Design a protein around this ligand. Sequence first.
Ligand SMILES: C[n+]1cn([C@@H]2O[C@H](COP(=O)(O)OP(=O)(O)OP(=O)(O)O)[C@@H](O)[C@H]2O)c2nc(N)[nH]c(=O)c21
Ligand SMILES: Nc1ncnc2c1ncn2[C@@H]1O[C@H](CSCC[C@H](N)C(=O)O)[C@@H](O)[C@H]1O
Length: 211
Amino acid sequence: LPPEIAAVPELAKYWAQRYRLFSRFDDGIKLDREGWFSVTPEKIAEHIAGRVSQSFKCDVVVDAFCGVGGNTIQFALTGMRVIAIDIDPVKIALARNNAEVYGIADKIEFICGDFLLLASFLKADVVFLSPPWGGPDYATAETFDIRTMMSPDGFEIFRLSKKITNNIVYFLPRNADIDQVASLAGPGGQVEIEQNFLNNKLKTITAYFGD
Ligand SMILES: C[n+]1cn([C@@H]2O[C@H](COP(=O)(O)OP(=O)(O)OP(=O)(O)O)[C@@H](O)[C@H]2O)c2nc(N)[nH]c(=O)c21
Ligand SMILES: Nc1ncnc2c1ncn2[C@@H]1O[C@H](CSCC[C@H](N)C(=O)O)[C@@H](O)[C@H]1O
């Protein structure tokens, strides 16, 4: 048991599913507490990367809140050039380690920085958004409000992302207000949504914007 894992009872279910999180976990994958709670399970990340490499111009993608690299790794495996951004230097170190384990570190440029302040000066074909939702407690809300229950504010993250591109992918809680999420598209805006499942269990949603 890793120190983070042994330290807390609530991390036991993430450890149990370590291979659903990273298939190559035993090849030296590392995460911290928040990393465990937040990492996109591999099958879901692979699915999202597949859809992106299908329906969008897909050369350069910004992973704006890259965490431990769950999504970043999957984008890189499809051959997209990724700009991976996280405000936490520890996450960047973890993500860099995990990308190497998967043999695609060279496909990625890592930035420790605040996406909110970088966005206006970034250029890319696709922006992928997997922000903090407020830890595991996010689920205790009957309906997740992306404006009031998310920091940074979900509409603000989207507005800044729009400076970069119209092709935006938003990774969001399974109890997210779907009316709210859809409204991000604005007037006449295009949006398609999917529920992401792991073993027939509802996990999260992903919204695909632009065309
Ligand atoms: C808290 N959180 C969770 N996730 C993702 O959502 C998944 C499910 O997280 P979960 O916390 O809902 O677990 P479970 O699905 O086991 O549900 P629970 O016991 O009812 O609470 C995690 O595997 C992550 O992929 C998260 N993803 C992002 N991007 N940000 C987050 O803050 C975040
Ligand atoms: N303002 C900001 N800019 C960039 N990253 C931020 C940020 N605020 C928080 N973060 C980072 O956003 C991340 C949310 S969790 C991301 C998980 C990722 N999709 C995975 O697959 O692993 C956290 O790691 C947090 O450190």
